[PDB]
Ligand binder design. Structure first.
Ligand SMILES: Nc1nc2c(ncn2[C@@H]2O[C@H](COP(=O)(O)OP(=O)(O)OP(=O)(O)O)[C@@H](O)[C@H]2O)c(=O)[nH]1
Ligand SMILES: [Mg+2]
Lengths: 48, 327, 81, 49, 146
RNA sequence: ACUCUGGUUCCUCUGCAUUUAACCGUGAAAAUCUUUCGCCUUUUACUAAAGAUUUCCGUGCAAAGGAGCAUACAUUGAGUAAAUUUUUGGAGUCCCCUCGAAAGAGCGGGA
């Protein structure tokens, strides 16, 4: 879900057509395990 | 750590992120706790080394879920004595006179044990007893931190102080006299109260389709766990099976479950409660020959003894090292 | 929403900041713009009113009707939105 | 997560995610999808109450 | 493919163990048998054993259950994927969207129904939607034969 | 109002496809070197693992040129088309006191 907010606020943010980007799973073990292991913050400006 | 997958990540970071050295890893275990399942039959006294003061204590099983309330800070020993006393008399229906007389939680300010002052003020004056109060609390917290069976923390014991001869003058009631002696009194009350071990239990939620339910019980049965609810997931084909399993028997539970179901089952596990290890840990009729997994009545004897071997303690509790014989 | 001109959009982003506005009768109100509207009705919290003689008062809330506002001073950072 | 949030005195709010799984995997008729969504909201409010 | 996937075969090869039905390789480290050290850290008298740490668990959690993993190229497998629940339709005559009887009914016996704060009273029942407003795909059929 | 271009399909050249968790390749070869295992009276051809490099069958995109087919000017980068309370169809004008040569200005006052 955060991948969508990233994609909306970052024009160059790439989501694969067939795999989740998981921008906030920044650790390589989170990339490999496929689950979020540690919390990652993301500050963005967004319009209501 | 909290579970298998937690340690796998903690150790991964130890290997690949932080330490970059070879580490031996032991087989996983759990910390046990110690409890008494019965009311202390004798009342147990401990004379201070100077042979002047005479502490007396008893031990009891602590009533259901009061330890969860203490540990979750639903009640706090730092509250004002009316508010503190109000909690015990309102929620647990305690006598108001008892509720005034709590002296500590232990082994820390949120620990699952209570010390009470059951000393009636005719037998010793409340002021003199108040002079040694802080030493008695500190030896009780020492006792409950180590505990007499296998030096694992005591839990869910209600210790009542109920008598105290105390010397008239400070040099005969010093902290170094009282603090070791309250430990010996707590330990003698403990070992009279029918001691037992406690192990932590997970609560397991399994989501699996209908045909995998018989596998779930089969994998639980090998690990002493049991199913407490088996309900369909609404608007789904899967079912939800809820179960308690010992943490000590949960290592590889998730892996066993997924393999015997081809990953059609998956499960997740959280700590839920402390429950007695079965059997009597002090039963010397049981010998722990290490050839095989012990049958379930011997577990308390095994877990105690091997925890003593691990910690570098003597093989067996010399229970009479604390008691007086005509106690 | 449906499109509306940039000045009104910027006014909605001026919400929550301090603003100053002068009314057609000349009084200057400084306050925190708690609400704006597409007709630029304004609710100011925490308001200070300044009369043309230079006296002043605090006012806890003010609603000013949109077609009675002469101009506003928005905050500076809104030039980046 | 809901209970721990209330204990920590956080404002609990709800997103019912992965709603495509009703359409595409479960294939519930739209009427039965509404009941599935409603029950999730009911389950959550059962916790809050 | 839990424990029968590419990463679990890599971990098995690295640990010099074999999955039942997996491939078997020449030992990557030739002398991992040297755990016959008789040191007290491994002492069978001190360890409590409940279910034996069989090699599936060594592969499933490579780092909690193994030594030397800085020199061994052990690999994490993907932990879990939320199980897909698509049931194949048997009958072409069924609607594309139908409540399959393998899906459990949407009920729970003891939930309170949530309070629906619907608009009420005489002025509010008269609220009408304009005559052109219409669902966003009203004339499209919900499903086709495709 | 300015300059900017015909669609398609194919050929060929050039450049780029390293911050790899992972993937130019949802497939999968061969060699060399170094090392360690097994064959063995030697070498070749080998066993089967590691590490480092190569070759080979392939891949993507951009850009340029050409070659065939049937044929269309728009359109990209730069930039077009509401008199009834909250803005764009008038609550507008005029007249005294004050400072000041001079013309404005007061929540000034009056029709
Ligand atoms: N059908 C469907 N699947 C989704 C959707 N969003 C995510 N998923 C899938 O669900 C899985 C989990 O997605 P994640 O984004 O990793 O969810 P997550 O909660 O952050 O996982 P953790 O943080 O580790 O608990 C992946 O396999 C996703 O492909 C969705 O919107 N619809
Ligand atoms: Mg020769």
């Amino acid at each position: 879900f955060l991948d969508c907010l990233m994609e909306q606020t970052h024009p160059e943010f790439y989501r694969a057509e067939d795999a989740d980007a998981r921008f906030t799973d920044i650790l390589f073990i989170e990339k490999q395990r496929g689950c979020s292991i540690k919390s990652q913050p993301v500050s963005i400006v967004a319009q209501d | 750590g909290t579970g298998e997958f937690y340690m796998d990540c903690v150790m991964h970071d130890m290997r690949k992120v932080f330490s970059e050295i070879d580490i031996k890893v032991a087989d996983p275990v759990v910390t046990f706790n110690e409890t008494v399942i019965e009311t202390s039959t004798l009342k147990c006294f401990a004379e201070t080394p100077n042979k002047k003061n005479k502490i007396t204590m008893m031990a009891e099983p602590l009533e259901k879920q009061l330890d969860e309330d203490i540990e979750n800070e639903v009640v706090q020993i730092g509250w004002n004595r009316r508010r503190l006393g109000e909690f015990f008399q309102t929620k647990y229906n305690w006598d108001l006179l008892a509720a005034r007389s709590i002296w500590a939680f232990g082994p820390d300010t949120t620990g699952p044990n209570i010390l009470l002052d059951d000393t009636l003020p005719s037998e010793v004056d409340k002021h003199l007893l108040s002079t040694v109060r802080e030493s008695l609390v500190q030896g009780f917290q020492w006792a409950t931190r180590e505990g007499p069976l296998c030096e694992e923390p005591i839990r869910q014991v209600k210790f009542k102080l109920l008598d105290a001869a105390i010397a008239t003058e400070p040099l005969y009631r010093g902290g170094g006299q009282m603090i070791p002696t309250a430990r010996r009194c707590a330990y003698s009350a403990f070992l009279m109260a029918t001691p037992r071990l406690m192990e932590p239990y997970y609560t397991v939620e399994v989501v699996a389709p209908a045909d995998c339910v018989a596998a779930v019980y089969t994998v639980l049965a090998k690990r002493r766990g049991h199913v407490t609810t088996d309900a369909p997931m609404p608007g789904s084909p899967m079912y939800t099976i809820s179960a308690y399993i010992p943490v000590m028997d949960s290592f590889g539970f998730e892996t066993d479950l997924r393999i015997h179901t081809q990953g059609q089952a998956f499960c997740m596990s959280a700590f839920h409660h402390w429950q007695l290890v079965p059997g009597d840990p002090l039963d010397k009729s049981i010998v722990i020959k290490t050839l095989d997994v012990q049958p379930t009545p011997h577990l308390a004897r095994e877990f105690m003894i091997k925890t003593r071997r691990r910690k570098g303690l003597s093989e067996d509790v010399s229970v009479n090292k604390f008691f007086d014989d005509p106690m | 929403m449906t499109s509306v001109g940039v000045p009104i959009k910027i006014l909605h982003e001026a919400e929550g900041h301090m603003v100053t506005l002068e009314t057609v009768t000349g009084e200057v109100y400084r306050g925190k713009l708690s609400e704006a509207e597409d007709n630029m009705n304004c609710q100011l919290a925490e308001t200070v009113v300044t009369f043309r003689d230079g006296r002043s008062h605090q006012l806890d809330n003010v609603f000013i009707r949109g077609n009675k506002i002469r101009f506003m001073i928005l905050p500076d950072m809104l030039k980046n939105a | 997560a809901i209970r721990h949030a209330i204990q920590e005195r956080l404002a609990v709010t709800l997103c019912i995610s992965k709603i495509d799984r009703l359409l595409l995997e479960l294939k519930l008729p739209p009427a039965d999808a509404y009941f599935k969504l409603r029950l999730i909201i009911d389950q959550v409010n059962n916790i809050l109450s | 493919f839990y424990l029968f996937d590419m990463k679990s075969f890599f971990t098995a090869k690295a640990l010099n163990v074999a999955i039942p039905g997996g491939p078997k390789f020449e030992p990557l480290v030739k002398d991992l048998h040297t755990d016959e050290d008789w040191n007290e850290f491994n002492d069978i008298n001190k360890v409590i054993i409940r279910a034996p740490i069989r090699t599936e668990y060594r592969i499933a959690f490579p780092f909690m259950y193994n030594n030397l993993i800085s020199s061994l190229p052990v690999q994490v497998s993907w932990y879990h994927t939320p199980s897909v629940v698509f049931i194949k339709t048997e009958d072409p005559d069924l609607p594309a969207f139908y409540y399959d009887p393998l899906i459990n009914p949407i009920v729970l016996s003891n939930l309170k129904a949530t309070e629906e704060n619907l608009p009420e009273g005489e002025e509010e029942d008269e609220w009408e939607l304009p005559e052109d407003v219409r669902p966003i795909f009203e004339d499209v059929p919900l499903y086709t034969d495709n």
